Structure 1
C-alpha cells in the first residue's frame, strides 16, 4: 500500500541487548588490583578477592580520596609492580549525586586514574563495574541516569587508548552473588566482548539493529506550543519552520536568551507572517526561578505532548586532560534545563519524553568525548520518564547540511568514510514518523558501512555491528 517510505525507512536504527555465551576461563595470572575509594567497606570486594585468589591471582587493595589528585596515585602505582587488571568498585553505593547532576566523584576520579595510568604507561586493561544503569528492556526501572555517563565517555576511551579499558559490567545492586559466578570469564575472555550487561541470567552484550518501520494509520497533532530544546540557534531554527509547514498555533522553543541573540528580525517576521502568536524562551533555562517565571508568564491557553530533546549547547571537548568539572560546566545549560522541565512538567498534561540526541552518543566519537555525558543523562531521564504516559525514546540525530558545530574538522574527518550530510525535510518526515509510532530508540542517521567498518575496526576488534546484513559483506 506504500512505496515512497524508502528514504524514511533508510535512516532507522536501534540499540538493544542480545544474550551471548562466554570465552574460555582457565586461569588468571598477574597481580590483580582493586580500588574503590578510601571508604571501602564492601563485601563485594571480599567476594571479588576470593574469586580472584581462586583463579591464581594476587589480590591487592587500594584506597583513593574523592578527587585525591592527578599524579600521586600514579606515584604509588609505579612503586608496586606490573598489573594487568583493576576492579573499579567506586560506582557502588553512589547511585546519583546531589543537586548538581554531574558533580559525581566517581566519573572525574576515574578520568584521573586513567590519565595517571597512561602517564605511567602501565599497560593494564581497566575493568570498571557499575550499578544498574543499563536496562535489558523497557520493562525495567533505571535506578538513576548519572551512571550512564560513565558509558558515554567510556566507549570513546576505548578509541583513545585501545590497549586499556577492557570493558564494563551491569551487576544489578543487591544479590552480588552474580559477581561470584563468572567474573574471571568476563575479564579473561577471548571473545573480546566489552559491553557486558551482566544480569540474573548469563550475559546480554550490546548490539545495534536496523529499525524496520511498520507504518500505521495514526496522527499526532501539535496543538499550541511544542517543547524542543535549543530555541532558534542552529538546529532549532530550521525546526521552527517545520511546524510552520504543520501550522501550529503557538510555540515556546527554549532558547539561551531569546531576542538577545536568537531568532532575529528576519526569522521573527517570517514566522509571524506564517504563524502568529509564537514565542521563544527569552530567559535562561538553568535557573529554576527563571523557568517558573516563564511558565507563569504564559497565557495558559493550550497544553501539549511529545517532549523533545534535540540539542541545547555545543561546547567543544575533543581531547585534553579531561577534568570532570569542565564537562559539568559545558553541560550546565542542557542537563539542568532538562531537569527543570521534568520537575515543572510532572503535574501538567503531556505524554512522555520523546528524546533526541547527537549521533556521537551512540558509539565512540574520538573528537566529541565531552558531548557524550549529556546525551547519556538525557537517555536516562527518558527511560525514567517512561514510568508514566508513553514509552521512552532514544533518538541519536546526526548532522545538518545547513548548520551544526560538527561541520569543520569533524565533518571533514568522517565525510570521507561512512557518514554524509542530511537534508532538513527528510529530518522532518522521519521525526513525524517517529512521533507517529513513538519508539524508544530511533537512531536517525545515514552511514556508508563499506568504509565505516574499516574505519571503526582499525586496531580494536568489536562484536557490535554483527546484526547488519550489509555489514557482513
Structure 2
C-alpha cells in the first residue's frame, strides 16, 4: 500500500541517559532579569551537586548577537550553557513568532559560535510539547525553538546540546535529571521530563483507519493558497471527493496564474468553485471573507496551505527575520483559528512540513512556522475543537520546478509523492482523527546516511526500516 508506507507520527517513549559521570568545569545559566528565578536556583543546585561551578548570564531582551559575543569572550573557559530564556516567559500580544526567547536563542547560539566557546547549548522549555493527548501545549510559539533547534543541531553539532521540556512552573523534574541529561552517553537531545519519568521524541509508523469514521466535505470548504501548487491539488482531491462548493483564497486571487483552468477543472469534476483575493495576514479581510459565505452553504472546513519559503543559513537568521517571512502561515493560522472557533467546523487542517518533523540544514527559517502549526493543532484538540497539522514531505504534482534542490533531496532519501496518493493519506489521517500526521516518502537507507552525516540521533530508533 503506497498510502500506508507514507504515514508516520511523533510519540514520546520512556528513556534515560546512562551514567552522568558528574560534571567538570563552569556552566553558564542564561536568563532574563528577574525571570525564572525559581528554576534557576533548581538548575544551579542540580548542576553544582554534580561537581561544577555555576555562573549566570543575564540577557537583555533582543540584545543582539554582537553584545553577547563580547560578553562570552570575557567569561573564560566554559563547559556548557543552560538557557532558561523560554522559562517563565510571558505570552503577550504581537505576533507569536515575535517571542523574545526565539530571537535571543539564535543570538546566544551565534554568539557562542563567534566567541568560540566550543561548548554545547541546552535549552529548557515549559510545556512546549505534549507526551500525550492529556497534556496541553501552553504556548504554541515555544515549539518554534524546537523546530529551529533541530536545524541548528544539523548545521553546527558542536554548539548544540539539545532541548528539554518540563512542566510549566515545576522544578522537581529538572533538578533530578538535568545532571544526567547534560552528561549522558545515550545521545538524547530531544527530551520531555515529567513527574512519571523521562521521555524521548521518536518517529513511529502509523497504522490504518480501521474505523467507520469517514470525513466528508459539506457546505463550503475554504482552501487558503488554493491557487498555489499544493493548494490546487488539495482542491482537486476535494472535488473528486464530492465537495459541493469550494472557496479558494490567495493574495492574487482571480488574477492567479492558472486560476482559469483550475476553476474549469474543478467545476468539470462537479464542484461550484469560487476564487477570491484575500491576504490571510489581514484580520479584517478574513472576517469579511467568512461573512460572505452563503447561509445555504455554511463553512464546514478549512485547509490552510498559504505560505512562503525563505531558504537561508542559521548564521544569517534573526528572530525578527523569521517572524516577518512566515506571516502568511502563522498569522493566517491564528486568524483562521480565532475567527472560525465558534463555527461548527468538521475539519481544520494546517499544512506543516518535514522541516519541523525532523528538520534539515537550510530550512532553519522555515522550520519555526511549521512547528507553530503543530502546537496550535494540539491546543485546539485540547480545547475540544477539530484540528490536523499535517507534516508534508515533498509533492510531485506541485510547483517544484527544481534545479539544484530537488535532485539533492531525492538522493538524500526524500522522494516527492504523487498528489493523489498524498491526499489519500490525508483522508486516512482525518478518518482516524490524527492530530499531527506525518505524510512523506522516505527511503531510510539513503536518508539515515545523510541525516547522521556528522551527528548521531535517536529520533528514528523505533523505525524498523531505519533499524535495519
TM bracket (short chain): over 0.9
**What do residues 334-392 of structure 1 show as CA deviations (whole Å, max 9, x unaligned)?**
21111111111111111353443222211021021111111111111111110344664
| Range 23-32 or range 246-255, more displaced | 246-255
For the structure 1 residues 406 and 269, does the alpha-carbon distance in structure 2 shift closer, same or farther, using more than 3 Å as the test? closer
| Range 66-75 or range 39-48, more displaced | 39-48
**What do residues 401-438 of structure 1 show as CA deviations (whole Å, max 9, x unaligned)?**
13245834331212113121211111232222222222
Q: CA deviation at 1:318?
A: 4.6
Query: 3-state SS of the aligned residue for 1:396?
Result: strand
Relative to the length of structure 1, the TM-score reads 0.94
Relative to the length of structure 2, the TM-score reads 0.94
Q: CA deviation at 1:243?
A: 2.3
CA contact (8 A) 2:223 2:246 kept: no
Query: 3-state SS of the aligned residue for 1:413?
Result: helix
Q: CA deviation at 1:42?
A: 0.6
For the structure 1 residues 286 and 355, does the alpha-carbon distance in structure 2 shift closer, same or farther, using more than 3 Å as the test? closer
For the structure 1 residues 209 and 80, does the alpha-carbon distance in structure 2 shift closer, same or farther, using more than 3 Å as the test? same
Match of 1:88? 83
**What do residues 299-331 of structure 1 show as CA deviations (whole Å, max 9, x unaligned)?**
222234454344532233355420111111111
CA contact (8 A) 1:95 1:143 kept: no
- 1:278 aligned residue (273, 276, 283): 273
Distance 1:181 1:406 in 2: 51
CA contact (8 A) 2:137 2:375 kept: yes
Q: CA deviation at 1:17?
A: 0.4
Distance 1:233 1:322 in 2: 26
For the structure 1 residues 214 and 244, does the alpha-carbon distance in structure 2 shift closer, same or farther, using more than 3 Å as the test? closer
| Range 110-119 or range 354-363, more displaced | 354-363
Distance 1:387 1:163 in 2: 37
Q: CA deviation at 1:250?
A: 0.9
Distance 1:300 1:464 in 2: 47
Distance 2:128 2:344 in 1: 28
Q: CA deviation at 1:38?
A: 3.0
Match of 2:169? 174
For the structure 1 residues 410 and 319, does the alpha-carbon distance in structure 2 shift closer, same or farther, using more than 3 Å as the test? farther
- 1:266 aligned residue (252, 261, 264): 261
Q: CA deviation at 1:23?
A: 1.5
For the structure 1 residues 354 and 276, does the alpha-carbon distance in structure 2 shift closer, same or farther, using more than 3 Å as the test? closer
CA contact (8 A) 2:301 2:348 kept: yes
Structure 1 residue runs of 5 or longer lacking an equivalent are 1-5
Query: 3-state SS of the aligned residue for 1:237?
Result: helix
**What do residues 113-153 of structure 1 show as CA deviations (whole Å, max 9, x unaligned)?**
11111112211100111111110111122111000000000
Structure 2 residue runs of 5 or longer lacking an equivalent are none
CA contact (8 A) 1:233 1:263 kept: no
Distance 2:339 2:116 in 1: 48
Distance 2:13 2:5 in 1: 23
CA contact (8 A) 2:333 2:350 kept: no
For the structure 1 residues 276 and 128, does the alpha-carbon distance in structure 2 shift closer, same or farther, using more than 3 Å as the test? closer
What pairs up with 1:156-167 in 2 under 5 angstroms? 156-167=151-162
Distance 1:190 1:119 in 2: 27
CA contact (8 A) 2:307 2:326 kept: no
- Cα RMSD (Å): 2.0
For the structure 1 residues 201 and 136, does the alpha-carbon distance in structure 2 shift closer, same or farther, using more than 3 Å as the test? same
Distance 2:173 2:431 in 1: 40
CA contact (8 A) 1:222 1:304 kept: no
- 2:104 aligned residue (102, 105, 109): 109
For the structure 1 residues 428 and 175, does the alpha-carbon distance in structure 2 shift closer, same or farther, using more than 3 Å as the test? closer
Distance 2:129 2:25 in 1: 30
Distance 1:65 1:397 in 2: 37
Distance 2:341 2:102 in 1: 29
For the structure 1 residues 389 and 52, does the alpha-carbon distance in structure 2 shift closer, same or farther, using more than 3 Å as the test? closer
Aligned length: 468
Distance 2:319 2:155 in 1: 17
Distance 1:329 1:244 in 2: 34
For the structure 1 residues 335 and 38, does the alpha-carbon distance in structure 2 shift closer, same or farther, using more than 3 Å as the test? same
For the structure 1 residues 357 and 69, does the alpha-carbon distance in structure 2 shift closer, same or farther, using more than 3 Å as the test? closer
CA contact (8 A) 2:345 2:386 kept: no
Say whether residues 1:250 and 2:250 are aligned partners: no
What pairs up with 1:286-297 in 2 under 5 angstroms? 286-297=281-292
Say whether residues 1:449 and 2:444 are aligned partners: yes
| Range 243-252 or range 314-323, more displaced | 314-323
